[PDB]
From TrEMBL, chain B:
The protein, known as: Envelopment polyprotein
Glycan attachment points: 36
Family: Belongs to the phlebovirus envelope glycoprotein family.
Record's subcellular location: Host Golgi apparatus membrane; Host endoplasmic reticulum membrane; Virion membrane
Length: 51, 51
């Protein structure tokens, strides 16, 4: 004779946007080091990288 | 002015010869040869460049 129902409840209708992509951008700093050496051989004849 | 550290592209010294002479002339200009060569006291514009 009868059956149950299905209720739909709506509370808020806000203006949002989609999600094209998702990522994380961290904070970075400046860190560096060097070393002072001498030629003393044929490894530093003219330049550091040959080609 | 030895090699292994000094860099030159091309056409910095000329060669001339008539009969087994092979005389070489100079093409290098000194520092006081280009235009807009200022000195220690400089007042170009509103800035007064001192030392
Ligand atoms: C010297 O300076 C003037 C004015 O700034 C400029 O017009 C001229 O091209 C400069 N000379 C050179 C060789 O750059």
């Amino acid at each position: 004779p009868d059956s149950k129902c299905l209720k739909i409840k709506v509370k808020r209708i806000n203006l949002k946007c989609k999600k094209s992509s998702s990522y994380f951008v961290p904070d970075a700093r400046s860190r560096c080091t060097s070393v002072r050496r001498c030629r003393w051989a044929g490894d530093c004849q003219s330049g550091c990288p040959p080609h | 002015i030895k090699k292994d550290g000094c860099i030159w592209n091309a056409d910095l010294v000329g060669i001339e010869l008539r009969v087994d002479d092979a005389v070489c002339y100079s093409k290098i200009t000194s520092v006081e040869a280009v235009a807009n060569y200022s000195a220690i006291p400089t007042t170009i514009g509103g800035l007064r460049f001192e030392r």
